[PDB]
Every structure is written in C-alpha cells, then in structure tokens.
C-alpha cells in the first residue's frame, strides 16, 4: 500500500467527550519477536506437581494484542472525569489498526 518510505498510519492518542459518549483512542509502539523458533510445542505441567497444578496444552509461535484493561484507553484524568460525573458506562464499538510495520 505504501511500499518503503510512505507511512501507512498516524499517531491518534486522545479522547473526545460528546454528550452521552466518550471516544478514547490510544496508540502504542509494539515489538514482536520470533516465538518458539517458528514451532508449535506441546506443553504440560512438570512431573511431581500437585494434582491441582496439573495441566496440558500447546504453545504457539504467534503473539496476540491485548487491550483488556481500562488504563490502555483512559488516562487518569479521563478516569476522574468519567467516575466523578457518570452513574454508569459501557462500551459500544471499537476500531483497531496495525500500521508502520517494520
């Protein structure tokens, strides 16, 4: 889309309060290494662990983007503005973007 030398996005970190809505936007810089050396590895609890700590699963070479915390979208001033003036809130919709990939 933008080959080499053309930016594919802009930095949008801000919040807009409009009546009964607040739209919070956040931008961060991420680093993604190579996980498991491009391999899927079966993982399980160590031998000798207690029965409560036993588990079985798989480790993937993929990563994931997590923003399931309020601090990822609300500044402390935004939080104070939200909690001192509103009797409730709920999420409505979200937009996600990855850009400027090197």
């Amino acid at each position: 889309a933008d080959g080499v030398g053309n930016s594919s996005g802009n930095w949008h970190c801000d919040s807009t309060w409009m009546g009964d809505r607040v739209t919070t936007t956040s931008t961060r810089t991420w680093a993604l290494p190579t996980y498991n050396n491009h391999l899927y590895k079966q993982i399980s609890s160590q031998s000798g662990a207690s029965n409560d700590n036993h588990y079985f699963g798989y480790s993937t070479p993929w990563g994931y983007f997590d923003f399931n915390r309020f601090h990822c979208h609300f500044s402390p001033r935004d939080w104070q503005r939200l909690i001192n003036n509103n009797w409730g809130f709920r999420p409505k919709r979200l937009n996600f973007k990855l850009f400027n990939i090197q």
Partner: protein
C-alpha cells in the same frame, strides 16, 4: 470594573425590586381634618418569590495526564452531614467553597 468583593461587574445590573404594603387608614374622624393620617390598620404580607437564572458554562478542555483537585465531601463518619440540617433542623454551611479547582496553563 470587576467588583473587589468578587463577582461580575454590570453597568446595568439586575434592577432593584421594591415592595411595600399599601397603607390602610384606620377609622377616620367624622369631622374633616387637614392633618395627614397618622393612624393605620396594622398589617403585614406574606407570599412566594421565584428567581430563575440561566448561566452559560465554559467547558473544561484540559490535556493534563494526572488527576486534578476536585471538591469532595469527607467520607469519614460524623455526627452531622455537611450542608444539611441538624437535630434542630437548622441549616448550616460548614465552610466556604470557591470555584478554582480545575487547572489551566498560563
């Protein structure tokens, strides 16, 4: 011309509203007297007064990161709640509250 005691300086402020009871003369003499009336029926008046003011607000548009100072009630227990009536039903204002809690850059 901002008032030194605080507030808004107005060249044409809200007008003074003057109210008084109309004097009702008491029993006059059956003979004419040119002296002005000095005896009146004692009376007072009671009623209701309504004042409605529309205020314009300048919304805060700050971009500071950390939280601001806000006026708040104190959570700790107390014998009386602030800005309420006591067991005598007497309303009191425990402290003066200003308006300068949010912050703006110079």
């Amino acid at each position: 011309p901002s008032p030194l005691m605080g507030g808004f300086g107005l060249k044409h402020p809200p007008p003074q509203i003057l109210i008084k009871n109309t004097p009702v003369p008491a029993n006059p003499s059956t003979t004419f007297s040119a002296a002005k009336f000095a005896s009146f029926i004692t009376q007072y008046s009671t009623g209701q007064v309504s004042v409605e003011i529309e205020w314009e607000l300048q919304k805060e548009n700050s971009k500071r990161w950390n939280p601001e100072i806000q006026y708040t009630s104190n959570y700790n227990k107390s014998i009386n709640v602030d800005f309420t009536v006591d067991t005598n039903g007497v309303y009191s204002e425990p402290r003066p509250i200003g308006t300068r809690y949010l912050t703006r850059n110079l």
